[PDB]
Amino acid sequence: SLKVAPKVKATEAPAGVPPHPQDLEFTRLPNGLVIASLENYAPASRIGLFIKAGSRYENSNNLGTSHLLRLASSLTTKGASSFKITRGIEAVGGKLSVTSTRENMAYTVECLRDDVDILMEFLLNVTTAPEFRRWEVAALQPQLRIDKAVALQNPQAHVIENLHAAAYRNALANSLYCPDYRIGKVTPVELHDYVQNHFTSARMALIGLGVSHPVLKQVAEQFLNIRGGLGLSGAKAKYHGGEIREQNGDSLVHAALVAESAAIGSAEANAFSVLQHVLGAGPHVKRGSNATSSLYQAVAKGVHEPFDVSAFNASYSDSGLFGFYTISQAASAGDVIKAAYNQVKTIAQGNLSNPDVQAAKNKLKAGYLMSVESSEGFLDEVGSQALAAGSYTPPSTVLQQIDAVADADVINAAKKFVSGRKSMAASGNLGHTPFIDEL
Amino acid sequence: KAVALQNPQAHVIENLHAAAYRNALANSLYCPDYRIGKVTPVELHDYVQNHFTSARMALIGLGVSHPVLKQVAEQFLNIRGGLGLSGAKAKYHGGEIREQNGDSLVHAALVAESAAIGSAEANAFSVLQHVLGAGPHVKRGSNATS
Amino acid sequence: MTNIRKSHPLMKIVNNAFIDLPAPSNISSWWNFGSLLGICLILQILTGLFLAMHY
Amino acid sequence: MTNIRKSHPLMKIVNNAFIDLPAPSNISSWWNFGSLLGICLILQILTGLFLAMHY
Amino acid sequence: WALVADLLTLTWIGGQPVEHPYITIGQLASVLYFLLILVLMPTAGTIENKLLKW
Amino acid sequence: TATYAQALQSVPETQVSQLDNGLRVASEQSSQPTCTVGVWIDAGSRYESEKNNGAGYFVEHLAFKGTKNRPGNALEKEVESMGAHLNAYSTREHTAYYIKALSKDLPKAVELLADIVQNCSLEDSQIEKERDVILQELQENDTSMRDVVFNYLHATAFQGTPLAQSVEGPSENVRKLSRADLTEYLSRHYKAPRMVLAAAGGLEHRQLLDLAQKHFSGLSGTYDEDAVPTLSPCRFTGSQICHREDGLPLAHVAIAVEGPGWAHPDNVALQVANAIIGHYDCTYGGGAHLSSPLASIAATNKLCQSFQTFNICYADTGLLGAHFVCDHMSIDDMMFVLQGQWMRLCTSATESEVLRGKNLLRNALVSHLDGTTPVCEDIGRSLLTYGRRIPLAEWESRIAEVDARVVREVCSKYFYDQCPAVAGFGPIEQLPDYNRIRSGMFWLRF
Amino acid sequence: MLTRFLGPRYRQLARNWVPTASLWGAVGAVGLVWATDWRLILDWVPYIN
Amino acid sequence: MAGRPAVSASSRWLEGIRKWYYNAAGFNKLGLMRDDTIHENDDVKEAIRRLPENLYDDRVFRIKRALDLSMRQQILPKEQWTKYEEDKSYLEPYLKEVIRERKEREEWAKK
Amino acid sequence: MLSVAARSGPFAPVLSATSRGVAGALRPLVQAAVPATSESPVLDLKRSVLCRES
Amino acid sequence: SHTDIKVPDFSDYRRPEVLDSTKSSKESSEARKGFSYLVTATTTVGVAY
Ligand code: HEM
């Protein structure tokens, strides 16, 4: 109700106490842990534990450990069993979900504010003190195939996995799902090593939604020992640039042509983000023709068949991938990629108008505000901020940063993509889809 | 395909042509995983009617008189091959394919573009092939000359 | 219908031939004689046994 | 034609309980009374029927 | 084997007339037949269960 | 210091004001810099006869394609360059057009919304090009097993009634629909008295009312002798439809009975009953430990690929039941335990599991309103079905009054010994006969 | 649900089946009486006296 | 501290009664440990399924050879018997957890 | 603006105990549905989309 | 194209009260099932005799 977009709330006639908003409390513990407690006085309370234990932190030996660790929740711990956790969570109606990207791994629990203390114990025990019994890990192993099958049912979820694989030789290239050869090859020893190395104060942050600061403060820092020195990540990564082409006889061809962009926090990343909306990265009108979308409009002429195209901006803590993602028939797959690619080249040549930039800034500002508007989306925004950075930035400050992006910076961002080393990942019927050297 | 791919060297060779070439020569010798069951009798008839047509054939026999071979071979077609999106005239591209399967032993194949058969340059590579050693000659040997 | 029915290694599965057995829809009335014959058989045994107690 | 796949769609499948049934190796002689009991039934019925033809 | 022996005692005393020696033995054998199975045998299993650390 | 009960009381109260022509202007004030505003109208398949069935889907398609003031894509261009999101959905009873933007952008969003409603263009080329568009995803929607089954269930549960029509409508009706039918449909169902303009976010209620007064005043009500048309009851019909197609891998089956309706208070008790049965589809970490007995058994021996419990509510009817996705040799094994769970609540429901269901329902209401977008839908839809909008605290009062005795009585009134409607799709050979399905509604068989 | 007490749930389940169990015993009573026209039961009914 | 509830059993002391019973039971003569002769119910059967492969395979052969001895009505030589002191419970830790799990599950149902 | 959803880039799969497994951030698929060719492939070995908790 | 399906006319076999599409089917549900069970109850009564 109250802190569902800015972490500073406007005055709303202080009376009663629940009907009154307040400021935000941000603290960093001496051991490096970060606590960002919120009290919006909402009926529902949400607690999230954000960890730098993404899928990129697995080395070549223990691939897929993060996927199994994502599924490893609701298992027997040192304080609560698997039965007690599943029964205890559902009895109070609460939910327990684990969100894992290539960099972070968020442990989120949602329930009502009356029973948030119960959800506290079931969160620390799952996150910090898992038993990882051999029989239980073995029984959960076939779920890896089931989870990977449904997640790969969507064709564009598989190109993104190959896109990072083709572009990196390192951490960021690891897929989010356990490899086909590792289903059954994961062992409780690997899970204990992954948990011990990658669960530490310096790589964790606790975020709450409707909970007092001392309640969060007292339940944070117990037994965090060492950083993630197991392998690969924890010692930087590097960008490669490649091309992965997979054929599966599908009717629709998915193509993702990207380049090297800047990491988050950097002022150049904002240039790509506003450039991402100049090119158009998602419809705003249901069943619309995308008149303002430069990419869709560019391919509209010539191609008179079903197709789709949008910008792609995958930004990370150390690097990033920027480019366009397209969907087209195999009969005219090459035309759509080439037409969309040529439009980006015109942007790099300075053929950009200030009203086009002004609209893109408006889309970026609006798109960000609605992203944090939801209670669940708001937790993810601050949670990742407390991990990538050491403090929270209010949305008003973010809007200023977006408004402080010069039109020249957008052109330079376009030049970086055009002149950069590309990384193409394609899927479907690749009879007509061109290669990187063919643009 | 499963039995023929039990040998890890078969997979690398299939991937080696896939990585190196874009055109005809990059096609694997085995039906793709998505095409098992998707082949139709009309496709087989088209393949036969286009490629099983005399000028692309040659009849060779051992221990058979020439008139027996000559008479039996005078019943053939007069057609040539067709076109292809991924197979027709081959052109070298050069790439890199990396597959991970957790195997104990690692197979690697690093190749470049050599010359075609008949050409005198192909003979240069063939004799160069045995300079570097391309198979043992002594059982359980230490390969001194390799 | 109450449970997953659990169990099953008993003589109930032998009785699935009387409950869940597939049968043609257009089976006419000339077919009750199969069950009628079983009715007749156990009727002769029932009356016959009580007849044999005085014969 | 598979010798193992015998005349299965018949009553022999029931008789697999007499031929191919797994049984413990360490069965002592005290288990023999199960088969003896069946022989006692058959013997009693066989002699009983011929007794009932004159009683 | 105490139950088997007692079952044999019941068989032996079943065929004998009801007089003063078989009245006493008959009651004792019968009361032991039920006492063994109902009380002594379940208590026997409990004692050994304790005797085997479980 | 802020208990669960106290937080519900501090939720801002919805403000509802009526215009001169009967337009209901509603809003909920908040603190977000963003907001969404939309118009909910009483229209859908149930309001269309067979001749004009599927007009709403045809009308909705052309709603954003051009207006009198902004012909062509100018209406779309205004929204996109502004940074707002434009969405629209239509069901058998309601259609909506809501636009999400910044709070400072409210004045322009309302002006655009009036143009879409009052000044639809329906150009002759637009219908012809949209007709081919509507004929396209109709073929696509044939591939959606879940949507086809629910259309099948609606077809036979309310057979011979307006409620049995599809929102999209038959393909033949799509081809023969002309501009005359569309404009007639607009002039008959798009009227101020049957309209509500809702909003939520960082907007003052006074601003929204004044904006509606400026733009929606031109809207008219009580057009002719028809004025505001009234609905007619639709009779539930216990039946069974089985589209047996063995090519498709999985079997989708939905079985439901007549519900109470939108305004019936028995919805709260029924919603607790559905929460007790729960849902599960092959991706939960709980597995065999799931509290719901149906979910626990379905996960222990891998009964279904998916299953869920629904309560569709209409003006005077409903479809209360469940829908499950399973193998071709698991339909009988789960329909037996699905109906077995229903007869347990009707006969023997313990207070402990109702407490689990009550808590589950409590979280469903609070967590559904995760922003301005679902709040306006709740504000707009309630004002068309419940009349007033029910506060969350009031929902808690009704939820706290449900116990085991209420659940046993309410379930036994709609579930026990009632003829259900069955819809099947795929390899449904194992699907039990209707008499086997019908006889599963009661126990002890004597 | 209250801190895992000792057999509260089964007491609630038993009470649900008590009204039908009590009426089920009537079939065992009346049906047995109906079977053998038991003398001291068919004396309080008005019609069958 | 063993044998019987009394401080001293009938046949002197208390610890030797259990040692005397172990030789009297005679499952050591067959080459079986104490937990190799337990009754397999729905609880013990699950606790067997959690045994490590090295320990489960060892149990299989100990049972397999014992049935061979019982089939021939024979026993292992005097030097191959299971010593009472060397007999260790390889199944008690696994049984206890299934006891703990079943007790929680059973008591959670009644609430 | 430091997250994986605000930038609408990479993916973030979710595994839950009371909710369905949901994976996917913003990437171009909505605009493809309007010229309907993406047939919404059958639920062959698949769970129910959109989840059920609201 | 699945929306082209329409349940055929069952009015030939429909009971007289559920003939009207406007009138709700819940009004006569008690009596529609009451008459059918009356046949079953009267058949068991005759068989019991
Ligand atoms: C398929 C089974 C049977 C058939 C077809 C059958 C048929 C007959 C017939 C035709 C008669 C001649 C009665 C007459 O003409 O007056 C008869 C008599 C008799 N049957 Fe059977 N019977 C069957 C089974 C039995 C059994 C199972 C019993 C005894 C357990 C039995 C006991 C008798 C006796 C005692 C009579 C002589 C008394 C009398 O005729 O009324 N029957 N039976």
Ligand code: HEM
């Ligand atoms: C388990 C099956 C049976 C048992 C245990 C059994 C037992 C006996 C016994 C203990 C006697 C007393 C004989 C004596 O003390 O002299 C007897 C007599 C007799 N039984 Fe059975 N019987 C069985 C089955 C049958 C059957 C199936 C029949 C006829 C089909 C039959 C016909 C007779 C007859 C006619 C007698 C009198 C003749 C005689 O006592 O030698 N019995 N039976």
